[model samples]
Target: GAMGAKEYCRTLFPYTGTNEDELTFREGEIIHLISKETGEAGWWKGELNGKEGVFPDNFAVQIS
Candidate 1:
């Protein structure tokens, strides 16, 4: 549960967002997940280097 903390993930591949609401991150970048499951499937909300936006969940892998 992300009730009091954010879930962490490391990018597995570079992702270029096609929309403004999406996030762009490089491979190996660390991301903090805000929502693993959103209204849409295969997408998630995360923050990276102070940038917060939605990105494909497959772009990153969960990490401790």
Candidate 2:
């Protein structure tokens, strides 16, 4: 099931340093498996989740 946008945002960016961005779902909203170091967003493409797209660093964040 699709997790509500607001809830997902909260969970995804729980700390101040973390960042996020509103990416247009070219093929509808799907699962976002991100890279560990770069924090780049990408969808699962087969066994390897290749870099399909990316947003600027510090695009989004949750401040205290």
Candidate 3:
């Protein structure tokens, strides 16, 4: 089930997932948002390069 509105964002930097539950992305890539999560949440769930998982919220900037 969906928890929030589907949205998109662009990565500002590269990120390598330290675990299987995290996502790996490169700078300038577009990510599909799953959820923004909530307050105090540093990890934002999203999908990139056909893979999905949580990633540092600061790594990406929100886009339409």
Candidate 4:
């Protein structure tokens, strides 16, 4: 729904989960910030180059 989707952010280093289905990002990369709780969920979902999954919400920014 992207009710929480954003442009990009400086995020996750390594994801300890599924492949491709896991949100993996570097220190300075661009990703589509997707799924996130209205307030503080501690986790976030997004898409990188072609990867996708949930990561730490605190690690990302709304590409403002």
lDDT of 2 by residue, 17-64 (tens): 122333322222232424322333332111112323333323322211
Q: How many residue pairs clash in all the candidates, one count each? A: 0, 0, 0, 0
Q: Each candidate's lDDT (Cα)?
A: 0.83, 0.27, 0.83, 0.62
Query: What's the CA error at residue 30 for candidate 2, in Å?
Result: 9.9
TM values, all candidates: 0.84, 0.21, 0.83, 0.60
Residue 23 displacement (Å), model 4 = 1.9
Better of 1 and 2 by lDDT: 1
- Model 3 scores a TM of 0.83
Task: Point out where model 2 deviates above 4 Å.
Answer: 1-33, 36-52, 62-64
lDDT of 3 at 24: 89
lDDT digits (tens) for residues 1-64 of candidate 3: 3366778989999989988778988999888898778333788888877788899889999885
- Candidate 1 at 31: error in angstroms? 0.2
Among all windows of 10 consecutive residues in model 2, the one with the lowest summed lDDT is 8-17
- Ranking of models by TM-score: 1, 3, 4, 2
- Looking at candidate 4, what is the lDDT of residue 16? 49
**lDDT (Cα, tens digit) per residue for candidate 1, span 1-64:** 3342668889999999777778989999888888877778888888887878899888889885
lDDT of candidate 4 over 1-64, digit per residue (tens): 3465355666535444455555656667667766665244676667777767777766666674
Assess the local accuracy of residue 57 in candidate 1 as a C-alpha lDDT between 0 and 100: 88
